[PDB]
Design a protein around this ligand. Structure first.
Ligand code: HEM
Ligand code: HEM
Lengths: 137, 137
């Protein structure tokens, strides 16, 4: 279930973070404009940039911290408030996060792994709600 | 589901609140140490004691608001803080709440009605977790 999938993801977090994030940027190419250094590059070009793997891992590490601290796939309001207040999240609206989770869910479903994709879909919905309640537009 | 059950209970709340609270006090008779005016009384005696009806209705009035404000059966932290800090809940520990929800779920399962008993089980558990988070021992 959800707890085990956090351990699956953590065990090879570099690899999953890159593959899920690429699945997001490819499913929603307009989302690339939040990442100007990534524009005009294919997947394998991106994986050659040191900050791409380092950034993407750090994003999914904080995702996994928020997921492990959630109760019944409802994240803490304090964690949602950390993500709203991050400087690097200044432009963003909740739909950015909505689409990342749609991509993540789609990825888990297409993988051969026994991920609890229903729980990650609830988690994504409940994180979007919590980001709104913590003051994201 | 859970949202419908909140409307079911609200539709006949003083009856459900007294039957549920009686089921709790009768399943865990030691719990009357918190309600000493209830000692030595049959169900029908308690149902003719004004503060039994009035206070038990007010307990359920607030319980249904906490449930209605929850997301996926996880209550708001502000509601859990309210319940920890209430003067009338001084010295209570989370075990008191755990047993209340055990009794409430068993009452739902035994009823002729159609409740989502599993959602109430989760809600009890998640409420106890939130009470502990908000500093109840
Ligand atoms: C739960 C989901 C998310 C988490 C846990 C998260 C976490 C993080 C973290 C930890 C960083 C710092 C990375 C570093 O400096 O190495 C970061 C940077 C950033 N994040 Fe997020 N983020 C999430 C969702 C998103 C989404 C959906 C977008 C836009 C579609 C976004 C846009 C950015 C941008 C533009 C930066 C700075 C640029 C960069 O690091 O390349 N984030 N995020
Ligand atoms: C989610 C569950 C609970 C909610 C929403 C809640 C709510 C309330 C409210 C609104 C009152 C005020 C009643 C009034 O003064 O008219 C009350 C009083 C009180 N509650 Fe709770 N309560 C809950 C669980 C419990 C539990 C589990 C116990 C102990 C087993 C308990 C013990 C008390 C006591 C001792 C009083 C004051 C004495 C009395 O009303 O007779 N409560 N509670």
């Amino acid at each position: 279930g959800f707890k085990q999938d956090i351990a699956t993801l953590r065990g090879d977090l570099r690899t999953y973070a890159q593959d899920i994030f690429l699945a997001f940027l490819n499913k929603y190419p307009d989302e690339k404009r939040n990442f100007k250094n990534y524009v005009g590059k294919s997947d394998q070009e991106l994986k050659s940039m040191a900050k791409f793997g380092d950034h993407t891992e750090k994003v999914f590490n904080l995702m996994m911290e928020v997921a492990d601290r959630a109760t019944d796939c409802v994240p803490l309001a304090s964690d949602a408030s950390t993500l709203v207040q991050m400087k690097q999240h200044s432009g963003l609206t909740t739909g950015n996060f909505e689409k990342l989770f749609v991509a993540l869910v789609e990825y888990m479903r297409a993988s051969g792994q026994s991920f609890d994709s229903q729980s990650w879909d609830r988690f994504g919905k409940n994180l979007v709600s919590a980001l709104s309640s913590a003051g994201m537009k």
